[PDB]
Design a protein around this nucleic acid. Structure first.
Length: 400
RNA sequence: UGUGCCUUA
């Protein structure tokens, strides 16, 4: 920083004024220095005269190159956010031009800014704070090619997409839903640590839940169609997503959410039914199988239970059956525990048994009896394992 | 006995 601003011992003076810095032409040196930016930060939160604001608008958000240099700076991005806020709060004759200029600067450099570790915060704060009509234009500047995938899977940029979804009406980012829904895009994005969160956030925003009751019916129709288009793609690749280290969370979200009931049923039919024994032995998909048991409609739950109890031919030599395999499997054991807990909850009154115009308690009692009988017969082997002891305890607790 | 992400002075 400028020598004029330094004391005898090479430190920034203590009685420095904002106007001195603004007048000096040296703001850019202060803004990228920890101590200097800290000073500016505090100074700009105070009372500002019209000319101080004017200078800040010109020097921080007035020229594209300096704006980008501050926005992409570890310290400067904070000053940029503060000045954007002041600009938005200052309804003088220059307001429209300043905001249009900011929209132009960001739009022209959208991809580069989104992927930047610091400028992404400038984008996010602009999306939620700018006049909505102008914030929509930033969304319009998002890329539509391979760069959009890069944005969705980026440790920093994914949060820009999530902000868009949070604060911008759907019509503006509907293209992102369609982009993500393309088979190859869905595969790449869902199978990524950050991308899978982006997709879950999108699904959440497209869900007709209590948080969307403020939408017009026209907007609900728009949402409904977008949700349907995305769910079709997810359902078409259900098998692949359910077994994946990251996308299994998406499938679980859908299965677990009552507001996505129709899609829950599709998924269970399309990839889980007839595959329960195999999927229950998978590290990732076993969690999906658990969610399906916990949330399936009673008619489908009955089919799932029947598949475990009766769906598979026992080993030709040993007579070991699906329940035998699952009970002692490293992942399958948790699915059987889930089945048991569900039945104990039902017969204990902790879980509603009426559905479809009938009380299914008789079914849960039947399933419970089968599990109780197996656990009784195999108690010695089961007691060797934590999972076995837990099932024995679950049944014991039910009695009393 | 079994999985993730929520990122800046």
């Amino acid at each position: 920083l400028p020598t004029w601003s330094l004391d005898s011992n090479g430190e920034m003076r203590s009685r420095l004024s904002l106007s001195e810095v603004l007048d000096s032409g040296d703001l850019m040196k202060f803004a990228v220095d920890k101590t200097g930016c800290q000073f500016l930060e505090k100074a700009v939160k105070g009372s500002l005269t019209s000319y101080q604001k004017f200078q800040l608008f010109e020097q921080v958000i007035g020229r594209k190159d300096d704006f980008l240099k501050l926005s992409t700076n570890i310290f400067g991005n904070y000053l940029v956010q503060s000045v954007i806020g002041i600009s938005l709060a200052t309804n003088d004759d220059g307001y429209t031009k300043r905001q249009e200029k900011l929209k132009n600067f960001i739009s022209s450099q959208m991809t580069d800014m989104c992927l930047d570790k610091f400028a992404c915060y400038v984008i996010q704060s602009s999306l939620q704070n700018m006049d909505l009509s102008l914030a929509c234009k930033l969304v319009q500047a998002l890329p539509r090619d391979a760069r959009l995938i890069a944005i969705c899977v980026d440790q920093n940029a994914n949060h820009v997409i999530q902000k868009v979804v949070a604060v911008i009406p759907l019509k503006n980012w509907e293209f992102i839903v369609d982009f993500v829904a393309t088979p190859e895009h869905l595969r790449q994005i869902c199978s990524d640590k950050y991308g899978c969160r982006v997709v879950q956030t999108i699904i959440e925003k497209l869900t007709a839940d209590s948080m969307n009751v403020d939408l017009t019916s026209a907007a609900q129709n728009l949402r409904e169609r977008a949700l349907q288009r995305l769910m079709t793609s997810v359902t078409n690749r259900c098998q692949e997503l359910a077994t994946n280290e990251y996308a299994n969370y998406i499938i679980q979200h859908i299965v677990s959410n009552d507001d996505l009931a129709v899609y829950r049923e599709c998924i269970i039919e399309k990839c889980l039914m007839r595959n329960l024994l195999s999927l229950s032995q998978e590290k990732f998909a076993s969690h999906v199988v658990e969610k399906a048991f916990l949330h399936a409609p009673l008619e489908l739950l009955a089919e799932m239970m029947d598949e475990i109890f009766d769906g598979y031919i026992p080993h030709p030599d040993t007579g070991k059956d699906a329940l035998d395999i699952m009970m002692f499997h490293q992942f399958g054991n948790y699915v059987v525990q889930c089945m048991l807990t569900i039945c104990c909850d039902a017969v204990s009154g902790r879980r509603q048994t009426k559905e479809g115009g009938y009380d299914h308690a008789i079914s849960f009692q039947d399933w419970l009896k089968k599990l109780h009988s197996r656990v009784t017969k195999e108690r010695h082997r089961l007691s060797r394992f934590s999972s076995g002891k837990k099932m024995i305890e679950t049944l014991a607790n039910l009695r009393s």
